[PDB]
Amino acid sequence: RPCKYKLKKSTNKFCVTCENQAPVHFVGVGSCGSGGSGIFLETSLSAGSDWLTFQKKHITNTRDVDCDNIMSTNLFHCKDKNTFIYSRPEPVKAICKGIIASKNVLTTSEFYLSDCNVTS
């Protein structure tokens, strides 16, 4: 038990940013949230990371998270929240095709969304 968190689950699409035919940034859940401010509280995988690590960061092919055993995983850092996407890599990567412009579109399908938010 690393920290204390509250129970949040949903089932919906997600928004991201494609850069060189692969999504290297998260944007939002069921919508695309505008980035036109000096905010830096996000992971910002655009500079110093890739799509190849974006997957391991907050996506899984099997939700095994209980928000009490993540002391054993890479997420032991006691963050304020995280947003786990239970999907395959295909419906995430293939949202874009030929895009170099650092942009994507919101998905259309409904995936298992697994948030967990801190409770002090």
CB 22 within 8 A of CB 103: no
- Given the residues 25, 45, 107, 114, select the one marked as catalytic: 25
Q: Residue 111: how many CB atoms within 10 A of its CB? A: 19
Residue 77 annotated as catalytic: no
36: tokens are 């036109």
Q: How far is CA 115 from CA 13, 34, 44, 52, 86, in A?
A: 13, 20, 18, 22, 11
Q: Is 9 annotated as a binding residue?
A: no
Q: Is 97 annotated as a binding residue?
A: no
Q: Which residue is listed with tokens 């295909």?
A: 90
Report the chain's C-alpha Rg in angstroms. 14
The structure was resolved experimentally with NMR
Beta bridge partners of 114: 9, 84
118: tokens are 């801190």
4: tokens are 């204390």
Domain boundaries, the chain: 1-120
Q: Is 82 annotated as a binding residue?
A: yes
- Given the residues 58, 60, 93, 103, select the one marked as catalytic: 58
CB 75 within 8 A of CB 105: no
Q: Is 8 annotated as a binding residue?
A: no
Cα–Cα distance for residue pair 45/57, rounded to 1 Å: 9
Beta strands in 1-104 (DSSP E): 5-12, 14-18, 23-29, 59-60, 81-86
100: tokens are 């170099």
